[PDB]
Design brief:
GO terms for molecular function: beta-N-acetylglucosaminidase activity; identical protein binding; lysozyme activity. With 129 residues, this protein is mostly helical. Helices cover 29% and strands 6% of the residues. Helix 1 packs across helix 2. It binds chloride ion (2 copies). The site of one chloride ion has 3 residues, from loops.
Length: 129
Amino acid sequence: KVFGRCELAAAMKRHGLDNYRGYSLGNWVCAAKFESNFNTQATNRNTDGSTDYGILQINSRWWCNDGRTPGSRNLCNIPCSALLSSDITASVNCAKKIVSDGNGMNAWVAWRNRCKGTDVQAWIRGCRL
Ligand SMILES: [Cl-]
Ligand SMILES: [Cl-]
């Protein structure tokens, strides 16, 4: 599913991400924009041979099992395919663990390089939320 910007903002808010670990909703929308272009089906191989999955590009080395990544810890206890559903519940529940690992949203390289230090509230401007 390719979400509209405000559609994804509303689903992330409903699932509890607004101000989760202190990160306002625009941070999560900005991250999803640059990670997946709002597309739940996005998959991308990483340099290390892991793969990133879903709207928030969650990786198979630590967080989900894809059957093809050495060292997989599957800390979210899910097949990586569950992260590609039109329903974002699994991605949100896992992202809540990722952002709790110690480095906050710096766990998402695209957030650090493209959202951090910017006007992230722009990503929810115009939304009826
Ligand atoms: Cl709808
Ligand atoms: Cl933090």
